[PDB]
């Protein structure tokens, strides 16, 4: 299958640096255009450069022109952009692209994409708390629980329950800016009131910019 | 509407 | 300044869809406007609606 | 440079609906439009190249057209994983633009929240910081109001809310109000109270707890 | 891969810039490295980012 894989996207000071890297597999960026598009609340969905690895033109978006480079290394499928002198408005979701692959004249693969998150802030790691069900936090037989994932930057975190093999009835909801500049979320997921005390119940917390990694196990209050 | 990072949706 | 003009869509089979429209009050207007002519194209004749001063709009296909 | 405009910004429909959204090039662009769906957590996804090419592997029962510079997606029977924003895309030019969305919602039901209510976990008051949480699970419309009370005193600006796009099976909201005290001031208090307004309610539904029972 | 001397001399007033950070002088020479179609306008972004941080 064709993908492409975003890496390189992170926290960077106003005036700093940062690369990323497009890594192709499934077909050969020498036959194709590769694009960088970039996605941000200011500009939605905004183009940032191409290039042709075949010939090695490239063009770049007016207001990138100079700061980033674009460029590909064919013996490694993978494209690359340097972004220097990055301001407020570079954060954004980074999306690596292909154009022209297999004949269709559009962007038919898109990475996942990785965030670039521009500010003076400094990385903090999360606290986890459990949300304990209780007999406040059930009714007709089922019972919530989860997860408070508090204080921490930037973004992103990701929640899992019982390492991926809980889905049904997981709601992880957007993070929320505190006044202190920090993010914090929460996960809950609903289940058989039968199952509290039996079944155990994890989120599993990753948060990448700080290395945090933290399985908590939620159990019902002692008293 | 306003695009969300968070989500990567349109917030209306 | 932004405003956001909130449109029923009111088929004539009964269905009804809720759309919105936002800009300058003269850009949104002429926006809902277009959005009805063009589905009026497929869906018939349109007539159109202001409560509120122009901000709520019914628009009625004639089927 | 080009710019498309995308209408509506928002549009609802039933599932089995069929909805049409707009797309205007401020120039020719030829067809060289192309269109994408963009689910919650996702990357843009092809649906339509070339104004009206359906991209292998999409439902039959999308379908793009171009009068002039005028360009439409049509989905002919709305489905509930159709929930997502959708862009339009010209390359005619460099540098190739996108219009700002349209984002699409399913209509269904009105389903009244279930309404829970979590105390500050102990581990988190051992470190002076209290957070209690308000959760409101599977409703729809959107719209609701959530408001906290302490010791029946009406709180306002310590507290914020979170809110899930719709569900993948059942098209349902589900929303976090979180209150945020010092331990201090949450000690000085005893009754914490949620109370929820919602259309499928036929009353103000409120949840408490007392701080310290169990 | 090898310079002409236009190249070469974007090169060194980037080298030679005391404003910049280490990281940010090696940012714009590996853009120069990166695409050398570019090299005014890399150069151009140097100087400004230079003179902002006098």
């Known amino acids: 299958e064709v993908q492409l894989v975003e890496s390189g996207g992170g926290l960077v000071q106003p005036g700093g640096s940062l690369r990323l890297s497009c890594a192709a597999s499934?077909?050969?960026?020498?036959?194709?255009?590769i694009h960088w598009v970039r996605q941000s609340p200011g500009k939605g969905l905004e183009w940032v450069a191409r290039?042709?690895?075949?010939?090695?033109?490239?063009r770049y978006a007016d207001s990138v022109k100079g700061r980033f480079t674009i460029s590909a290394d064919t013996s490694k499928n993978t494209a690359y952009l340097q972004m220097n002198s990055l301001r407020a408005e570079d954060t954004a979701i980074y999306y690596c692209?292909?154009?022209?692959?297999?004949?269709?004249?559009?962007?038919?693969?898109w990475g996942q994409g990785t965030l670039v998150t521009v500010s003076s802030a400094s990385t903090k790691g999360p606290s986890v708390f459990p949300l304990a069900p209780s007999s406040k936090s059930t009714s007709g037989g089922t019972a919530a629980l989860g997860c408070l994932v508090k204080d921490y930057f930037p973004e992103p975190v990701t929640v899992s329950w019982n390492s991926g093999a809980l889905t049904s009835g997981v709601h992880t909801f957007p993070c929320v800016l505190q006044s202190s500049g920090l993010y914090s979320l929460s996960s809950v997921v609903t289940v058989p009131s039968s199952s509290l005390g039996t079944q155990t119940y994890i989120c599993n917390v990753n948060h990448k910019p700080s290395n945090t990694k933290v399985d908590k196990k939620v159990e019902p209050k002692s008293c | 509407c306003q695009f969300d990072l968070s989500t990567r949706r349109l917030k209306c | 300044s932004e405003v956001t003009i909130k449109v029923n869509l009111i088929f004539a089979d009964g269905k009804i869809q809720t759309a919105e429209f936002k800009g300058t009050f003269e850009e949104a207007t002429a926006e809902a406007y277009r959005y009805a002519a063009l589905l009026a194209k497929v869906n018939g004749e349109y007539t159109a609606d202001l409560e509120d001063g122009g901000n709520h709009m019914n628009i009625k296909f004639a089927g | 440079d080009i710019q498309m405009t995308q209408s509506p910004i928002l549009l609802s429909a039933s599932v089995g609906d069929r909805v049409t959204i707009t797309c205007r090039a401020s120039?020719?662009?030829?067809?060289?439009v192309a269109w994408y769906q963009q689910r919650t957590n996702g990357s843009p996804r092809l649906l339509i190249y070339?104004?009206?090419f359906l991209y292998s592997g999409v439902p039959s029962r999308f379908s793009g057209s171009r009068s002039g510079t005028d360009f439409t997606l049509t989905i002919s029977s709305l489905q509930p994983e159709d929930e997502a924003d959708y862009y339009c895309?010209?390359?005619?030019?460099?540098?190739?633009?996108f219009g700002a969305g349209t984002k699409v919602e399913i209509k269904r039901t009105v389903a009244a929240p279930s309404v829970f209510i979590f105390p500050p976990s102990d581990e988190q008051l051992k470190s002076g910081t209290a957070s209690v949480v308000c959760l409101l699970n599977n409703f729809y419309p959107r719209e609701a109001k959530v408001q906290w009370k302490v010791d029946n005193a009406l709180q306002s600006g310590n507290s914020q809310e979170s809110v899930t796009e719709q569900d993948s099976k059942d098209s349902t909201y589900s929303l976090s109000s979180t209150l945020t005290l010092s331990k201090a001031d949450y000690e000085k208090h005893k009754v914490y109270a949620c109370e929820v307004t919602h259309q499928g309610l036929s009353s103000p539904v409120t949840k408490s707890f007392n701080r310290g029972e169990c | 891969g090898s310079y002409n001397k236009d190249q070469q001399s974007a090169f060194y007033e980037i080298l030679n810039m005391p404003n910049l950070n280490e990281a940010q002088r090696n940012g714009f020479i590996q853009s120069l490295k990166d695409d050398p179609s570019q090299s005014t306008n890399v150069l151009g972004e140097a100087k400004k980012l230079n003179e902002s941080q006098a």
């Open positions: 692209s292909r154009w022209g692959g297999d004949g269709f004249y559009a962007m038919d693969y």
């Open positions: 499934g077909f050969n960026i020498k036959d194709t255009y």
């Open positions: 290039i042709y690895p075949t010939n090695g033109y490239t």
């Open positions: 120039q020719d662009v030829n067809t060289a």
């Open positions: 070339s104004a009206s």
């Open positions: 895309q010209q390359h005619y030019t460099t540098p190739p633009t």
